[PDB]
Amino acid sequence: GSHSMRYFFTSVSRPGRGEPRFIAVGYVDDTQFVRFDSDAASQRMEPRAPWIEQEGPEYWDGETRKVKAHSQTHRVDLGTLRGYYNQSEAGSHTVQRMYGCDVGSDWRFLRGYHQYAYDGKDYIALKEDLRSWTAADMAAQTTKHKWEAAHVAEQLRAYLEGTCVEWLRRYLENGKETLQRTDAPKTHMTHHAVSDHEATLRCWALSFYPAEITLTWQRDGEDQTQDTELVETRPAGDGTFQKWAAVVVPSGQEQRYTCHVQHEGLPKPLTLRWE
Template identity: 55%
Template structure:
């Protein structure tokens, strides 16, 4: 297997000047896709710092340059990133062709080759962990075990590649150096330049709602919206005990405005709602928040009362208009009769 490596920067010693709350990550997503209608496979890439997309690249874009996704990306990144992405476009097209051939897949078919790589640091900025993973046609292909520096084959088709990589350690050593040094260096730079956004927090807006299904089953839903960063814990408690097996969770989702949303639901018998409490933990909250479902009987009653009053008012207005029109019509008739008599 031929090895195509990213150019390695000369690294300088970075002196940490502050401590950041929580851990932080830098992730690179690469994907190359072939389709019969494409003259060349399409290459795309996105770069994330924590949960914020900061760069993207599309080989079909006329400029052939990365696009900034946040205002604090500095121009001095452009030359370096443009060179990397242009080189990666050709390199991953070669990788897709080689791997497709290993599986005896036609070169003009619909296929994808993907890579996820990156690193995480602790709150003091020191290296926590790194990761390198490859996938082909949506299935695990190869992954680096960063502890043993051995490659894990996702299926039989990747075994030959695993053996070649382990026979020649140069590629593995490159990735070890990259995730522990270069990746950490760039993560520090991103965090410093974007600290007002990346190191800030937005507490969640919280709400507990009650839902009844057609068969009468009651569900309480604990919703968290508008929070940043994405790390959050929603836990349902029954009489103080965690209900992990009974809780239905959705994955944290982006809200489209740089914040996130998530909910957790639990089913129960009607009448036992007050036994349940939702515990919410988030970096933007000084301490855990505990929420119960509160019946909205008073507000419902108020709404019904307001609606009734509005209907009565509307009826009175309609009656008044009818009476006024009748009186006006009577006056017009009397005026016409008086003129004829005159």
């Protein structure tokens, strides 16, 4: 299957209360593997998955150096953007940056990403060609010009097409037992009367990896999208995911309904019926 590596960075100002808090997290696919938290005691990049603990001190020292530099850049950004938007010094603001790369089933580069948000809205993003920038408004155009002059896109392209892909492969190899696995969903259905003339049928998918899944209900083969309660796919806390989909069935009509499950770990999609 395809794979991805992503790093996510959040900095939040707290005027009067010291430096902004900075949190970095790194993922391969849907598995977190590192963190940094400016408020924590270690002041180091830390492992958050067992497979990465085998990395040595060279690795951890280097990642710590880099993430500290990221922390400083983003602290400065909070001040610069406060100025660019003519905002008061009293309020808390947020900056977010995400970057990373995708590869296909052949582990070859598919695409690269680098984007930046201020107070939860797009600020500046590298376009798919990794050569040009989208800027959200007039403030952002200024940053675009600074980053054009400093040839940032060329640097990021080299990272995204090169380093990121090489390391994603390295991590996939080194963490093979966790990262190269598929856990097919374990499925079941529940049935609960809501009255004497209706019942809820809930179709469950549990303990699956990766998180990507499709769960749908049909009635006599017709999709029931508008009448299905579908929850967001949610972490179990153990590296697997969960999801369910429910429909309210008039009593006596259970046989009309089918639940359809599609997941990488299922060679053929499943069709479930209450019967």
